[PDB]
From Swiss-Prot:
This is Trypsin. PANTHER family: FI18310P1-RELATED (PTHR24276:SF98), POLYSERASE-RELATED (PTHR24276). GO terms for cellular component: extracellular region. One of its GO terms (molecular function) is serine-type endopeptidase activity. It holds the Pfam family Trypsin. The active site is at H41, D84, S180. It comes from Fusarium oxysporum. Keywords: Disulfide bond, Hydrolase, Protease, Secreted, Serine protease, Signal, Zymogen. The record marks D174 as: Required for specificity.
């Protein structure tokens, strides 16, 4: 997260950190005791044994409850940047309570409205290009950017109806490498997306692009 602030205990109770080969990799959202939602690009094409999830901690290295993966399912139309969600099943179930909870999902057919406030969180780099990643969770609030404006930035075909955008036109606030797969919520604290892609991080005139839960909700419900 670029331009963020420290998360407090009990913020994002459903967030998980996802390590790969023992090192930082991405974020995700705990949907229920044995299921995590993340970005497809975080898991597609990699050995599932490399991954570990941690829930219930501000730290990505220590604390909370961990699990390995039992299975990985990517959206059946996932390709590159499009339809960038995956369902992970956990080898060890994680109960709610304390600083762990489960996400509430945006409805099928919903689409975040331009200009509304969203909050994104993760353990990714704090500088575009940074050499170390924070141990403790960061968060930042950014407005939704209309799909039309985002298409003017990236190209018409590049932004699909299963993506939405968020950021500030002058830059300075965004998700960044290592935040992929982690949550973006709306002003009701409903999970409306996962960190997906963008041109750099926090650049002027290049919004962050998020996989839309509302658009992909049928897939989520099938497998959650």
């Amino acid at each position: 997260i670029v331009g963020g602030t420290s998360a407090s205990a009990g913020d994002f109770p459903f967030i998980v950190s996802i390590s790969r080969n023992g090192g930082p990799w991405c974020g995700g959202s705990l949907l229920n005791a044995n299921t995590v939602l993340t970005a497809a690009h975080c898991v597609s094409g990699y050995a599932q044994s490399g991954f570990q999830i941690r829930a219930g901690s501000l730290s990505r290295t220590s604390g909370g409850i961990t699990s390995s993966l039992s299975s990985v399912r990517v959206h059946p139309s996932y390709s590159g940047n499009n339809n960038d969600l995956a369902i992970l099943k956990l080898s060890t179930s994680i109960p709610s309570g304390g600083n762990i909870g489960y996400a509430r999902l945006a409805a099928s057919g919903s689409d975040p409205v331009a200009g509304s406030s969203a909050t994104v969180a993760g353990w990714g780099a704090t500088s575009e290009g940074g050499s170390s990643t924070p141990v403790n969770l960061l968060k930042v609030t950014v407005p939704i950017v209309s799909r039309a404006t985002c298409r003017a930035q990236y190209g018409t075909s590049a932004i699909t109806n299963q993506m939405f955008c968020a950021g500030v036109s002058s830059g300075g606030k965004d998700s960044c490498q290592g935040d992929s797969g982690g949550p973006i919520v709306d002003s009701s604290n409903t999970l409306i997306g996962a960190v997906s892609w963008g041109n750099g991080c926090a650049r002027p005139n290049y919004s962050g692009v998020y996989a839309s839960v509302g658009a992909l909700r049928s897939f989520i419900d099938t497998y959650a």
